[PDB]
Symmetry: C5
Subunit: 174 residues, 5 copies
């Protein structure tokens, strides 16, 4: 017996519009990993199919549930009909206005197969204000390599936002 109700308490009911189901799963995925440990592709497939309830159209098989990124990407092709990387710039722009830059980096990297150069370049255009772009680049440039920059991107954004008095959604205190 998989403990579905604890997982259902963290996630909640699926979104009504089929198009917003892939983004929802990506945002709730880190919290699920902390509350319950998922160690095999088969366990992940059973949890995702139960959370979405009776959606035969969006059912996933054990092969496509190797990593959380693969599961979120497959749901995108079933809900939208296009592979994600073809229109990544538009998808990141929608998340930034509705949720914020930190949500866009996490979901953009899941859909982009962990490509730091493409995600960092697209996000830099939509960062809030000229000062934020210059300050963040200086801090990231000091890091030794692309792997180290990828791990510390969210930590370096939070420090810059705090100095300039911006909330998570980028709205100024003034």
């Amino acid at each position: 017996v998989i403990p579905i109700q604890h997982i259902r308490s963290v996630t909640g009911e699926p979104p009504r519009n089929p198009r917003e189901i892939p983004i929802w799963l990506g945002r709730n995925a880190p919290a699920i990993d902390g509350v319950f440990p998922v160690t095999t592709p088969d366990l992940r497939c059973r949890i995702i199919n139960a959370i979405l309830g009776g959606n035969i159209g969006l059912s996933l098989t054990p092969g496509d549930c190797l990593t959380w990124d693969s599961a979120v990407a497959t749901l995108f092709i079933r809900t939208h009909g296009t592979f994600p990387m073809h229109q990544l710039g538009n998808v990141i722009k929608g998340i930034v206005d509705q949720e914020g830059v930190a949500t866009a980096y996490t979901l953009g990297m899941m859909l982009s197969g962990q490509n730091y150069q493409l995600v960092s370049g697209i996000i830099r255009g939509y960062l809030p204000g000229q000062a934020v772009v210059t300050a963040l680049q200086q801090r990231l440039d000091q890091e030794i390599d692309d792997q180290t920059r990828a791990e510390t991107f969210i930590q370096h954004l939070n420090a810059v936002y705090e100095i300039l008095g911006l909330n998570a959604r980028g709205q100024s205190i003034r």
Copy 2:
């Protein structure tokens, strides 16, 4: 003590209109099998009667709960009043517009006692577009026998839909 609440988290509350209770059970049946193992006809009868709550009219006895298909079919005769195979073409046409082709194959086969020839022929008429009909037939024809075609029908539909840029409900990206 059967763990009803985990099963209730996956399913949800029964539909208010008595006519849509049989289709609802069919869509939620695969997810229930993954979360909790059902191994006997008696266990299935107790789970179905609890999920529908206090519906004395639609109660099922252990004899008619031998397989999930038998349980869904018996509810159809109590909710609608006609055996399913008498009007299968109309039932499949309703599911395709509301949910999609993949939901119609799974529920059509449960109501049709696993008849591949009748279900495949009815679905081919309602497939979206002339190109989808020709492409799917070529892939299915290559398979060795009817049992092998039945197992791979959903896998071969998903590949064709992805090439032609169609979502699960059959709506084009254009």
Copy 3:
């Protein structure tokens, strides 16, 4: 610790109108017995008092909870103010229109202290159509005795309804 939440998942919240609380408990009683075994009068009293929540007026003591029938009957005297058998014909007529004949036989026998002759005679008047009355009587008459007829009444109604194409609520396919 009694497992109240599993029992609450099957039942649901009590009805707002005090008059419909006795019928609600009768319909949900068979499902509760399957999910959790109730073996003593004391356990039944604790479960019924928790399900109704904080209703001091309708609280039941261990003495009146000997059988599910005794508990449903006592709630009727507290909600309505009259003993049930005094107005049984009217109560059965209300259930038949709202739910169906099968619900009326189960709840009519609980309120009537398992009297087959009174319940069968009252139901025969409200059966749907002249043909249903004649067909059911022929099948019941063949049975050896009143105990055997009481066990097989619902099974013999379902067979007659299926032949004449009627749904559980008695509405014809035509």
Copy 4:
């Protein structure tokens, strides 16, 4: 880990108006004792603080949770601002119209520190009809002492109400 969810299934969400929180706790207290055993003042304090959720204003300390009566009385001084016994007659009159006489005896005795003479005298004025007052007094007078009358008051009200055809809220069948 205290099993809060089973206790939350019996109780429900707290009332929005701060004034009706003390009466709500009193009505739900007997059911909680049956489902889960509370044996220490500390356990009671932890359960009451969790049920009311995040109400820092109405938080209770282990010292004032010695008995369920002490906890309900302390919430009355925080929600209303006056000790209960100062205005007991008005409080009992409100409960009788909204819920009934049986709810008023149970909650009146909790707020009145188990004083039979004051609660019985206040209730006798608001009993429904002249006949109910005379019949109940005759039965209570036969009992040997005040402790015996206190235990059998609700049992003797239910018998009188049944003979005169009154529902729990005191409304006649006519």
Copy 5:
């Protein structure tokens, strides 16, 4: 498997407006500690991230979850964009009108890093009525030192409010 559902029963769903999420966590924090014991910074981080569900913007790392005060303060900088102590007087004034003085002392001390002198001085201005200010000061002055006054502040407010017939929100009985 962390028992998230018991914690979710005490807390409830997060507030929709991002600005009121920090105050909500502070009010629900004492109840969570009683129901489930939290002994490590890592366990606290996993519980807070699950309770807020899928909010990537307000996610907290193990380093900033050393104490409940540190977690509530970090959420304030992400939701509002300013450190709390810069505008403490305004924050305490909002809580006093909406909830009461007792909620303002508990949340004011969490945001102010346990500074008794600043919190006590700000609260004294917003206490209800001239008599309450004089009576409370006399009782607090008798205590030996600032640590002893901090522990007994809520106990000494409740005694003064009871003598002057005030409810928790400061509204008089008159």
